[PDB]
Structure 1
């Protein structure tokens, strides 16, 4: 008996494909260092949890909250980065405005893409500390719900899909933007994979 392990997905493009918005130096360590670290961290914790389940680690030889909380940290660390990479694309394929159903929903709920961009940027910059900014598609209400995560595992909304995702941990921009997170946020719009976003949304319509 055991749990299936996680696997680092391949990057959808070269590490420099996002320049000049996000330097290849950032992407390189962000993917090969940070993301890989989450896959590894999640897997080692799964191996440890398997031992708890099998009884190879008996009472007093583990602290369950440390394992469980470490798992939500690493698993989300992996899942969110995997979404992050696929949510971006080199300028041209990336950037611009959304079309199809996504654009329609955005207009109905925010008036226009231009307004949405403002509100999202504003909400992303209001995030106290490290975390993420995402646009959910609530399959229950049909609302494109904006949300900011603190760390990788706090503030998520249960079961619904992430359509737009922006990494706000400092390692996602520091080497290039230093402490100017807001400039990184502005630059990020230029590599958003709107087509992938529309494609994902379609799956829930």
Structure 2
């Protein structure tokens, strides 16, 4: 038996104030240092309980510990995508090109229609959660969905290439109740270079994971 590899909190690809004016420094700081950090530690804690269980050292509720792992691991991986999905205005924002633009054109009828639908999905998440643009390994096509919490409505297979966090701690200090304005503004910091790179990996790698 080998002790599990621990999850670690990544640094941001930019400073805490680098996404101003669209997302203020205080949100970025709390969101990274408190919230994302909590999910990293929570994922590790659940794996530690599994480890101690397997070593005959403690008793565990398997369902409970796996629910804890699920929520925290999902919080961690969604955030690991979220941060580099954004970039300071200039590098961030604008209109995508490349394969992402092509698929957006073919499936959603262009960037404006895609933007409206993605925005709708993000704005209408019930409670806290995420708006998600994903690559489907079964059809090699894009799909949009919502995730509640970090780990409800998410499915196997689908590869998130672009996500927006609509947990209240992602916008409340700046936009208060007005999630809609937050979502509208977030477009100005989308790192389309990152999304394109994610799509290219998915195009090469995703289908074979399930092809078998």
- Greater than 6 Å deviation, 4+ residue runs: none
What's 1:121 paired with?
119
Contact 2:74-2:151 within 8 A present in 1 as well: yes
User: Map of 1:2-13 to 2, 5 A cutoff?
Assistant: 2-13=3-14
What residue ranges of structure 1 are gaps of 5+ in the alignment? none
User: Map of 1:50-65 to 2, 5 A cutoff?
Assistant: 50-57=51-58, 61-65=59-63
Say how many residue pairs are matched: 202
Contact 2:135-2:160 within 8 A present in 1 as well: yes
What's 2:206 paired with?
none
Deviations 1:34-59 (A, max 9, x none): 011111111111111101111111xx
Contact 2:137-2:157 within 8 A present in 1 as well: no
| TM-score normalised according to structure 1 size | 0.96
What residue ranges of structure 2 are gaps of 5+ in the alignment? 204-212
Helix, strand or coil at the partner of 2:83: helix
Q: Determine whether 1:88 maps to 2:86.
A: yes
Q: Distance in 2 between matches of 1:204 and 1:119?
A: 22
**Which of 154, 166, 184 is matched with 1:168 structurally?**
166
Deviations 1:54-97 (A, max 9, x none): 1111xxx3211111000000101111111100100000010011
Deviations 1:89-125 (A, max 9, x none): 0000100111001100000001110110011111211
| TM-score normalised according to structure 2 size | 0.93
Q: Distance in 1 between matches of 2:19 and 2:130?
A: 19
What's 1:199 paired with?
197
